[PDB]
Design a protein around this ligand. Structure first.
Ligand SMILES: CC(C)C[C@H](NC(=O)[C@@H](O)[C@H](N)Cc1ccccc1)C(=O)O
Ligand SMILES: [Mg+2]
Ligand SMILES: [Mg+2]
Ligand SMILES: [Mg+2]
Ligand SMILES: [Mg+2]
Ligand SMILES: [Zn+2]
Length: 889
């Protein structure tokens, strides 16, 4: 297993200037003819010409139209084609090959593959080498001339990058299309699509150049009607990049294509973006609300790559966060502007502090720019994406909008036609920083540590107020725990967005202030502070850190009620919950350990419960925000604060806290559930495909959250409400009715009802599967067996497999059954999947990421399953690397 190191980057001894491809798709095989117009680079030292080429069947290879002989002139080991240096020309030459590949049986969904009746490619990161020979790395920029031929009846629509310059008939019912893409691109941005695709189309006229852009969105015939929202999202994305960044689309056409079998959400192939159907297709009748936000995000994200990824590309894969982190940041800005709801930012924070913080405190912890990799397919992590995005967002927080935009424009203008590194971006931002600070001595050298240092910083506070002096002091400390990547951690440049709230009237006491913490600790003093304030810290979640506010619950309640910042209010609530959780957890644990016949639990703070009620009864307050306040922190957030987490004890802890709050608030919950119905379930625009109301969907979120709380509580006659909810036209509602009926004898009645409603839409059926998988059923293991036998069967569709198994892994009480049967189940699924799709197999390992954080027995059980998986003779390099790193081998 070859380990690739960041420090080892060297430019290639070769140049590829032109790629000329002929892709001939037949019934049982695809023939790929390729001519590479090549040259020797200034870095050449007379080395062998080595091409990446994985799983290719060689018919012939040639140099300058002279056929090469195997053994004497070249060797091929199914991974690398080595042409011995003595046979390699010293000037410009043509390398040519004809290879056979088999998309029909390509179940790994990388390279060229078949998804139902569509032939499609996926080349990022190292997939192009599965199509034809190449020096398969992003710094190898080339021009592409691509011809695709296929049966006309089966594959009437042929697509690749660039302009379609010819279409022709071929004897035997075949046809071809030629595509020429003159601008240079890395091979990971190559794509081809062939199928019986239907489309919706629109024309977009750019803001400044006034260029007409053809927008096409494609799917199989059955689902073409579900493409309208994606089209709207694309227009919105183009508009936002123009309006916020002054960036226009540079090409004549943009194609988006939905496929059923896809390893991730989507891929930004230049002018030919390819999507998991679940991230492009939606309808109000056949999609849950989440689909709308999801499509907006994914279409936006892949569109924003056109500049940050496509036009400015990566020098090497270690720079991944430069395109992924930056593009997530760009999508976040976009979505915040489109949705106009505080929940957009809140949801991103919620994900980071649960999923990413877990990763960063696990054996898998890495910086956003890792120092090494074995498998690129394992590199696309929440750290690279989500911490990367927070690192990119901090530049905006530090600089402000005006100077951030200046620095971003500097980055684009300077790097537009070329590859780039993280230092290039930091450099552009530093120029803006120099201009903002009004001195050319200012730098961001310390900021680079955000790229190189792994682990989550802990930021803690102490306060002082002198009433006589009207002087307030905030003393701040930062600390990152040593880990496997750095023994010595260094202080980071941490921007702390702060406000000061007057506890007497809830008013702001100071103007917008961002404290720049650049040392291990610092004291920030404020004069003319008339009364002792309550500090509002890390507004907007201004740095990706553990915040230790050292506030009392009284102070936190005041922020929750009266602060201006959504995040600080949300976080204050989070902190109140966390203090309660830790206390009750310890109480339950002590009782368990000591085998106590009786014991006491600390009740939930009554003024906190009053504050929740206050917020819930406020008409001005955001419905999405309300759904967060009535929900305890994510289990994966909680686990970062507990050693040897006993999952049964945590389940008991949550149960107690919810019961405590419900015992006081259930009547309020019910009243709200009923009063929200009219606006939440409004059908006025149900048949308007383009009318999307994020506030209304948040209202449904709140309703469904409250229904869940009331169902768990066995609120009197709530089954009546559940049954009526099942009759709603909105899948978010009727699928909720299924999940919440888990606590009632009518579960299987609704199981059958909702299955019938879901079965005839591929994506809706997958949503139903997720809903069943996540159902709080005592017989969940029996239900999963039913799903396997009756619905899933031997599907190799990643969406199907992920839907059945992943939501179940969030069942705290059942997945972590002390017998280890949950761990055994998922391990079996991972191993089975690894046989045909190593990438998805590694995704299915997610539950195991917290293995060393659990109680000693569950640690042992999880480790056993991981060692068992590692012992499988046929284990992929993908899965092996991941599990070796996770188990600290
Ligand atoms: C972040 C989300 C909006 C979408 C996300 N997609 C991406 O980030 C794409 O731009 C990625 N460039 C696609 C990708 C992901 C993993 C491995 C190879 C290729 C995905 O999950 O597919
Ligand atoms: Mg093969
Ligand atoms: Mg406009
Ligand atoms: Mg988001
Ligand atoms: Mg299917
Ligand atoms: Zn991306």
């Amino acid at each position: 297993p070859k380990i690739h190191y960041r420090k080892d980057y060297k430019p290639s001894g070769f140049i590829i200037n032109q790629v000329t491809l002929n892709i001939n798709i037949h019934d049982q095989e695809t023939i790929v003819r390729s001519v590479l117009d090549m040259d020797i680079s200034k870095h050449n030292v007379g080395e062998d010409l080595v091409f990446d080429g994985v799983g290719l069947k060689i018919n012939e290879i040639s140099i300058n139209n002279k056929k090469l002989v195997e053994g004497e002139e070249y060797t091929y080991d199914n991974e690398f084609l080595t042409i011995f240096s003595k046979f390699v020309p010293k000037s410009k030459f043509a390398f040519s090959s004809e290879v056979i590949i088999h998309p029909e049986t390509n179940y790994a969904l990388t390279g060229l593959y078949k998804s139902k009746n569509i032939i499609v490619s996926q080349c990022e990161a190292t997939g192009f080498r599965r199509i034809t020979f190449f020096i398969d790395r992003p710094d190898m920029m080339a021009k592409y001339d691509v011809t695709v031929t296929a049966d006309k009846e089966k594959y009437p629509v042929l697509l690749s990058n660039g302009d379609k310059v010819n279409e022709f008939e071929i004897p035997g019912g075949r046809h071809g299309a030629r595509f020429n893409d003159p601008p240079l691109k890395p091979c990971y941005l190559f794509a081809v699509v062939a199928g019986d695709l239907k489309h919706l189309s629109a024309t977009y006229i750019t803001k400044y150049t006034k260029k007409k852009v053809e927008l096409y969105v494609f799917s199989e015939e059955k689902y073409v009607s579900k493409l309208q929202w994606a089209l709207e999202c694309l227009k919105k994305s183009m508009a936002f990049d123009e309006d916020y960044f002054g960036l226009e689309y540079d090409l004549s056409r943009l194609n988006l294509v939905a496929v059923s079998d896809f390893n991730v959400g989507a891929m930004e192939n230049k002018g030919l973006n390819i999507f998991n159907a679940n991230s492009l297709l939606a309808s109000k009748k056949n999609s849950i609300d989440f689909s709308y936000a999801r499509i907006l995000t994914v279409v936006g994200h892949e569109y924003f790559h056109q500049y940050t990824g496509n036009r400015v590309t990566l020098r090497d894969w270690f720079q991944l966060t430069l395109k992924e982190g930056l593009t997530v940041h760009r999508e976040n800005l976009f979505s915040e502007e489109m949705t106009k709801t505080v929940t957009t930012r809140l949801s991103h924070v919620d994900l980071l502090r649960s999923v990413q913080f877990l990763e960063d405190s696990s054996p898998l912890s890495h910086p956003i720019r890792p120092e090494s990799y074995v498998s690129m397919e394992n590199f696309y992590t929440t750290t690279v994406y989500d911490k990367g995005s927070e690192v990119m967002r901090m530049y905006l927080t530090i600089l402000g909008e005006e100077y951030y935009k200046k620095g971003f424009d500097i980055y684009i203008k300077k790097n537009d036609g070329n590859t780039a590194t993280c230092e290039d971006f930091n450099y552009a931002m530093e120029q803006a920083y120099k201009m903002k600070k009004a001195d050319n001595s200012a730098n961001l050298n310390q900021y680079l540590l955000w790229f190189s240092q792994s682990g989550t910083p802990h930021v803690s506070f102490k306060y002082n107020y002198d009433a006589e002096k009207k002087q307030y002091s905030i003393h701040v400390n930062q600390y990152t725990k040593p880990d496997e990547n750095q023994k010595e951690k260094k202080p980071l440049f941490i921007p702390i967005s702060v406000g000061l709230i007057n506890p007497e009237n809830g008013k702001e006491m100071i103007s917008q202030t961002t404290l720049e913490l650049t040392k291990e600790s610092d004291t920030f003093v404020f004069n003319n502070i008339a009364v002792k304030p309550i500090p509002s810290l890390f507004r907007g979640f201004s740095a990706p850190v553990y915040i230790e506010d050292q506030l009392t619950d009284e102070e936190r309640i005041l922020l929750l009620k009266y602060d201006s910042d959504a995040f600080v209010r949300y976080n204050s609530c989070t902190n109140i919950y966390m203090k309660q959780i830790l206390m009750n957890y310890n109480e339950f644990l002590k009782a368990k350990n000591e085998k106590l016949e009786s014991f006491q639990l600390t009740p939930v703070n009554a003024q906190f419960i009053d504050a929740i009620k206050y917020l819930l009864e406020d008409p001005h307050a955001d419905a999405g925000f309300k759904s967060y306040i009535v929900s305890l922190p994510q289990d994966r957030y909680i686990i970062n604060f507990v050693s040897n987490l006993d999952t049964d004890v945590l389940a008991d802890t949550k149960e107690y806290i919810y019961k405590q709050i419900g015992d006081k608030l259930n009547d309020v919950y019910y009243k709200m559930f009923k009063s929200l119905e009219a606006k939440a379930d409004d059908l006025t625009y149900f048949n308007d495909e383009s009318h999307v109301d994020f506030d209304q969907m948040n209202m449904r979120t709140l309703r469904n959250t409250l229904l869940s709380l009331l169902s768990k509580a066995q609120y009197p006659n709530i089954l009546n409400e559940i049954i009526e909810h099942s009759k709603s036209p909105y899948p978010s509602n009727w699928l909720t009715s299924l999940s919440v009926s888990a606590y009632f004898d009518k579960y299987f009645e609704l199981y059958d009802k909702t299955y019938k409603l879901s079965k005839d839409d591929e994506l809706l059926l997958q949503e139903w599967l997720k809903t069943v998988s996540r159902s709080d059923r005592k017989d969940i293991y029996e239900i999963l067996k039913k799903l396997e036998n009756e619905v899933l069967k031997d599907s190799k569709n990643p969406n199907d497999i992920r839907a059945v198994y992943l939501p179940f892994t969030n069942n705290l009480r059942r997945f972590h059954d002390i017998s280890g049967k949950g761990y055994k189940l998922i391990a079996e699924v991972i191993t089975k999947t690894d046989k045909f799709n190593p990438m998805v197999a590694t995704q299915l390992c997610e539950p195991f990421k917290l293995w060393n954080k659990l109680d000693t027995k569950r640690q042992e059980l999880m480790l056993n399953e991981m060692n068992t998986m590692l012992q499988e003779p046929q284990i992929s390099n993908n899965l092996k690397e991941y599990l070796l790193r996770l188990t600290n081998k």
